[model samples]
Target: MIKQRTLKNIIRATGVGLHSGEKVYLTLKPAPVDTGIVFSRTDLDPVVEIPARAENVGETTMSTTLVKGDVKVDTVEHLLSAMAGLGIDNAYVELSASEVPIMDGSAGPFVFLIQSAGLQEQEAAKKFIRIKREVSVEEGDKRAVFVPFDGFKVSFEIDFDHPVFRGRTQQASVDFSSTSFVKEVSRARTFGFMRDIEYLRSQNLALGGSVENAIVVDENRVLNEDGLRYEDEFVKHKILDAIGDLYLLGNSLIGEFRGFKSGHALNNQLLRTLIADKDAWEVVTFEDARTAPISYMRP
Candidate 1:
């Protein structure tokens, strides 16, 4: 059967928070099968526990934040995306601060950490959230949707008005069934406009954003010394975010996802709507993971 998987060893990382402008330390530890991905606020007296779940999401304005009573953790998409991409079924993520460290503003660092820990298959079978029907959510001109499909695929389009993107603003049919997440998606960093910095700082957001961790663009050109990673890096980062945001469902999904200029808020809304409708989705496991369409890795 397609067994659940976890880390073979504990791994640690220390970096600055993307928006907090503060240093944060993180640890990734193995967990028993079906434990899902749990985050522990290690700074707390007793350590607040927060399972990575859609219903526990607190804020979606910029980053996905998980909240439980007085405890909160933010900027979880990259780490969670790495977990989902690497086929980690169970892990305990202990963080020293409220926000996960924004290592280079991409999932690559997290993926490397998981790789260093190695992979271990569990005795229990893996589970997947299979879409049963169409589910979608929209805000203004932005939309995020999931539909029943035989495999996990993602498509995204960015309606950027910047000249830097030119005509390379749309990317479609990124079938994870065949693509390597680390190479294609994990390295795409988050991006923003130069003009938004002042406003974001006023709102206590993006306080730590810089060229080192994000793609900063000007009115007419990409401001980074190094150009775009991919011609479609902007839209690809959206796909990266979607994978992590959708993982809040507590399982890797077996469905096709499409997003148009949608961010964390709409992604979470789509998940909430999908789960609320019993006919929209259900959980299932395959006798062999490869036999299923997702092509999740054994290692």
Candidate 2:
């Protein structure tokens, strides 16, 4: 059966925060079984630990931000997504800034960092949050849905009125057992509109954003020298974001997810809906060879 896993060694990296624009050091360290995932603000007097879960989400305006009491962590979706895609069940992330580094505006850097640290299977069995029933949420034109499936899979659609994104519809589906996270999904960078950047800057946001880290689009074309990573890079990045935000559930989900124009807000709302309805999901650990990753059993 699949077992819980964590890093074998501590991994560290430094980059500029997306909002603070100040250089920050981030370290990913292994944690004991059942520790789940947590973020520690080492810059604080007494290190504050915020359990990385949907219930801890405190902000969703520009990115997924988590808070507990006065301690906060922002722009966590990429790093968290990397951990989720890598099947890591327990880790302790330490940072010195209010936001995690943007790191190329994608999950690739975090994925590589985790691999550099190496992965080790922990002694405890992995518990999967099996989606027993359909759960869905909607806000404005955005929506997210989760349903029973044999393994984890995601399909996302995005629509931006810009010329480049107007006519495109990108779809991706992966079976965690066979898919490679770094190759399939990690490199898709975050994107932003040219008009929004100035407004964001006025609001003291996007302080670390640049064409180097994000795909900046104007009304007519992309501003980056190199064009898109994937033709559907925008939607892929959304899926990437969803993967990271959903990881806040603190367990690997065993189900299929479909999203339409969903962002941090709607995604978290979907999680809240699932948790609020006790009959929608169940947490259970797999113990037998029959319940291994290869088993195609739908929850």
Candidate 3:
């Protein structure tokens, strides 16, 4: 069995929240074995420790949010996705606001921060939730599925009904050992429709959202001067968000994820359905026969 891993040192980053429009500072710190991924609301009195588990999820309107009692953390998908991509098993993330900083609107910044902090192996076996059967959730034309696989893999398709994403659907198969998540997936920024901005403003949301941190598309064209980073960035972002949301299962998932126009809500629902079916999945650990005892492999 391979031991788990955590950050070697603390690292910090600051950015504006996508919804709150307030500047937020986030710090990543090493956590003890089996601690899992936790978010600490340093802004709250006495601090709040919200374990990054699927059941603790409270909202998924525009971003994945977690709540414990009176404390909450919002827009955690990007950062959490980076952690999962890097094969991090446990850590404590401290944030000064409800939503995490929307750094460059992707997971790249978080990945960089984690790289800067360095990874240290712990003396405990790492756990993974392996899929045993298919669990799926659907909303109209959108659907997401989780099925058995040897390791993590994601395939997604997005239909925006616009020129930017018209008839554009892309799929990628990534094995954690050979994939380049930070390069291929982490840089795909979140996108939104321009017409929805006004309604979002009325709801006091998307205040910090702009072309600087997202791909804003109008009825027929992209509003951002810079074109897309990738031709299928829309679907890529979906995969990014799915990776983060699935991490909420409290362990790395060894399965294949398939999504079609699926968002946070549907993704979380898939996890809920998977959990409800006892025969659908089980937690397991990995071991290398030739390795010294067992050590968790960090991507």
Best by lDDT: 1
Q: Sort every candidate by TM-score, greatest first.
A: 1, 2, 3
lDDT of 2: 0.86
Please give, for residues 98-135, the per-residue lDDT of candidate 1 as tens digits. 99999898899889888977999988888999999999
- 10 residues in a row with least lDDT, candidate 3: 288-297
lDDT of 1 at 67: 98
Q: What order do you get sorting by lDDT, best first? A: 1, 2, 3
- Best model number under TM-score: 1
Across 1-299, the per-residue lDDT of candidate 3 in tens digits comes to 56688999898999999998989999999999999899999988888889999999998888999998777898989988998888788899999988899988889888888888789988877787889999888989989999888767888876655676555355555555465787889899998898999899899999999999999998889888988997777777888899999999988887899988888999999999999997999978766525432223453
Per-model TM values vs. the true structure: 0.97, 0.94, 0.93
Comparing 1 and 3 by TM-score, which wins? Answer: 1
Q: After superposition, how far is residue 104 of candidate 2 from its true place, in Å?
A: 0.7
Overall local distance difference test of candidate 3: 0.85
Against the unseen true structure, what C-alpha lDDT does each candidate score?
Answer: 0.89, 0.86, 0.85
Q: Which candidate, 2 or 3, has the higher TM-score? A: 2
Candidate 1 local distance difference test against the native: 0.89
Model 3 clash pairs? 1-294, 2-295, 2-296, 3-296
